[PDB]
Amino acid sequence: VKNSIIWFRKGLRLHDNPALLEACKDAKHVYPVFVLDPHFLQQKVSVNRYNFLLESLEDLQRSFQARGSRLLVLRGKPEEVFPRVFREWGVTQLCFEHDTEPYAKVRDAAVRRLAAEAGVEVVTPISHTLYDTDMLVARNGGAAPLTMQSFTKLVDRVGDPPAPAPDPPAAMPPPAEDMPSAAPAATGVPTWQEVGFKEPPLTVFKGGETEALARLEAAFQDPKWVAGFQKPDTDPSAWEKPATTVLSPYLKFGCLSARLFHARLLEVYRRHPAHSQPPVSLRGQLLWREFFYTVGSTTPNFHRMAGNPVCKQIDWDDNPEFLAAWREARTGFPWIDAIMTQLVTWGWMHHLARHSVACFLTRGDLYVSWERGMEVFEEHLIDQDHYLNAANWMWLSASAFFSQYFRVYSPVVFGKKYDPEGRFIRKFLPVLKDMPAKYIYEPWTAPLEVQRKAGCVVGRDYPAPIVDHAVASKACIARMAAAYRRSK
């Protein structure tokens, strides 16, 4: 008889899950497993992202209960848990989605070697990305494309992505009863209070496949908006209704299928011949995701500067004061401090909002290494993706993929073009809620009478700007030019 395990790590969904379909096919018992490390708190991670993962597991649990099954949250590490449950559950086949992250490759290798010892077949379909990213490299001659212009030419010659897999059966084979490692009191989905987190989550985006599908349908309620989508024209100061899809935390955890997303975009594009094209279109945004996965997975030390071949070695400063002020949202620039406040409260910011604070920290004003900023984003971002965060940080720091270091965003002017009243600032920085719009982006320029009228005396209620942009900008640019000449 066939008893199988469908191992969840990413791909926290039931739709377009070929690993789940193979695990259920001709199976008497199916053990849906997510492996949790309860000492992951002795190692970094905000309660916002970890609760998003927990809500995603709860959604999977309710979805499995509706089909006569159950989600098992096994505690411990994979290398110690699987050799036990292989013999206990009579497992003959192990199934999980392919992953290309460095720790995943080291982890999945040992798991496979442990399965071959137990006589367990391992099935690992590709479903987290649009294509077999190792196939794109081989199709291109054996190296990853380093520009989006050439990558888009490759995917057009490769063809349409594989279509999404059908939905699993309305009923699935349940786990066998009275198995000790399957005891419900030891395999339930924990809450954020039981894993050690002491402060509650504040983000407004809920995890789970159900929410991922609802956000997808909501974005497709207006097909003209999807067809004419242009990423650089979207509004970074929009928070009540964000200007983009906000599907990144669901695509990160695999709550939403990228191939399903891509399949729905082609349906709209076929009936809208004037639809936007890469790199600005919605489909182009998925290609940016696939692009950085293709390069990042084939580039050693991709998340670091030293040892990274595609990354420029720049003599960034070691300034713990600029990092702390930027990290704690007290730079003195309300546009920057509001975005960093949205980071710690929501775990998500608009793409151009991240451009502002990444440029401010790195090549624009403070000249701190993008590795330091990447560490801060990885902690608070609910959509933190190993390859995407690092690639866009090297982009904004002009260390890879991007070279126009003379283009420096203004922490004073950039936001005023969209939100002249500072509604985005007043929402996240409530201490500036009564400051007139003439000085909301420059509170230090307000007369002292006006500062007292608003209850925001610069230096007492809100900090003074840690740097003068005009001076700090002309100093980072000059050092970037020197770095770019010594970069050969």
Ligand X SMILES: Cc1cc2nc3c(=O)[nH]c(=O)nc-3n(C[C@H](O)[C@H](O)[C@H](O)COP(=O)(O)OP(=O)(O)OC[C@H]3O[C@@H](n4cnc5c(N)ncnc54)[C@H](O)[C@@H]3O)c2cc1C
- Interface with ligand X (CB under 6 A), residue total 28
385 annotated ligand-binding residue = yes
The reply on whether position 289 binds ligand X by CB under 6 A is yes
Please state whether beta strands 3-8 and 29-36 pair in parallel, antiparallel, or not at all (unpaired).
Answer: parallel
Query: Strands (DSSP E) along 251-324, which ranges?
Result: none
Q: Are 294 and 151 in contact (CB under 8 A)?
A: yes
410 in contact with Cl ion (CB under 5 A): yes
Burial of 376 (0-12, 13-18, 19+ CB in 10 A): middle
Least Å from the CB of residue 391 to ligand X: 7
Q: Which amino acid is at 336?
A: I
Binding flag, residue 316, ligand X (CB under 6 A): no
Between 48 and 362, whose beta carbon lies closer to Cl ion?
Answer: 362
The answer to whether residue 442 forms part of the interface with ligand X (CB under 6 A) is no
428 is in an annotated binding site: no
The percent of the chain in helix, strand and coil, each rounded to the nearest 5, is: 50, 5, 45
Distances (CA, A) of 383 to 147, 205, 258, 275, 349: 24, 11, 14, 27, 10
User: Using CA atoms, how far apart are residues 51 and 49, in angstroms rounded to an integer?
Assistant: 5
Give residues 203-232 in contact with ligand X (rule: CB under 6 A). Answer: 231
Q: How far apart are CA 357 and CA 349, in angstroms?
A: 10
Check residue 49 for interaction with ligand X (CB under 6 A): no
The answer to whether 301 and 387 are in contact (CB under 8 A) is no
Answer whether 133's CB lies under 8 Å from 100's CB. yes
Closer residue to ligand X, CB minimum distance, 29 or 252: 252
Q: Is 365 in the site for ligand X (CB under 6 A)?
A: no
CA 64 to chain centre: 26
Task: Find which of ligand X, Cl ion, none residue 414 binds, CB within 5 to 8 Å per kind.
Answer: Cl ion
Select from Cl ion, ligand X, none the partner in contact with residue 251, using the beta carbon and a kind-dependent cut-off of 5 to 8 Å: ligand X
Applying CB under 5 A, the span of 323-331, 364-372, 404-412, 460-468 interacting with Cl ion comes to 404-412
Under rule CB under 6 A, residue 389 binds ligand X = yes
Which residue, 145 or 334, has its beta carbon nearer to Cl ion?
A: 334
Question: By the 8 A CB rule, do 57 and 160 touch?
Answer: no
Q: Interface mask (CB under 6 A) for ligand X, residues 248-287, using x and -? A: x--xx--------------------------------xx-
State how far the Cα of 306 lies from the Cα of 228, in Å rounded to an integer.
40
Residue 389 is labelled as binding a ligand: yes
Residue 410 binds which of ligand X, Cl ion, none (CB < 5-8 A, kind-dependent): Cl ion
Binding to Cl ion, residues 137-166 (CB under 5 A): none
Out of 377, 405, 428, 441, point to the residue binding ligand X (CB under 6 A).
Answer: 377
Region of 45-53, 152-160, 411-419, 449-457 interacting with Cl ion (CB under 5 A): 411-419
Closest to ligand X by CB, 258 or 472: 258
The answer to whether the CB of 280 falls within 8 A of the CB of 232 is: yes
Q: How far is the CB of 230 from ligand X (least distance, A)?
A: 10
* 424 forms part of the interface with Cl ion (CB under 5 A): no
Q: Choose, by CB under 6 A, the member of 89, 253, 269, 288 that binds ligand X.
A: 288
Enumerate residues 6+ apart whose C-beta is below 8 A from 344. 46, 329, 380
Q: Which is nearer to ligand X, 71 or 476 (CB)?
A: 476
| 351 annotated to a ligand binding site | yes
- Smallest distance, ligand X to C-beta of residue 79, A: 27
| 117 vs 233, beta carbon nearer ligand X | 233
Nearest to 101 by CA among 310, 464, 399, 389: 389
354 among annotated binding-site residues: yes
Select 168 or 284, whichever has its Cβ closest to ligand X. 284
- Count Cα neighbours of 447 within 13 Å in the Cβ-side half-sphere: 3
The answer to whether 292 touches 133, Cβ cutoff 8 Å, is: no
Longest dimension (CA), the chain: 82
52 is in the binding site of which of Cl ion, ligand X, none (Cβ under 5 to 8 A by kind)? none
Please, is 113 exposed, middle or buried when counting C-beta atoms within 10 Å of its C-beta (0-12, 13-18, 19+)?
Answer: exposed
The CA-atom distances, in angstroms, between 68 and each of 4, 29, 200, 262 are 16, 11, 33, 31
* Segment lying near ligand X (by CB under 6 A), choices 42-50, 72-80, 141-149, 242-250: 242-250
Residue 48 C-beta: closest distance to ligand X, Å:
13
Q: Is 423 annotated as a binding residue?
A: no
Answer yes or no whether residue 414 interacts with Cl ion by CB under 5 A: yes
- Residues 146, 147, 152, 153: is their CA dihedral positive or negative? negative
> What are the residues binding Cl ion (CB under 5 A)?
409-410, 414
> What are the residues binding ligand X (CB under 6 A)?
231, 244-248, 251-252, 285-286, 288-289, 292, 350-351, 354-355, 358, 377, 381, 383-385, 388-389, 392-393, 396
Question: Residues at the annotated binding site?
Answer: 231, 244-248, 285-292, 348, 351, 354, 383-385, 389, 392
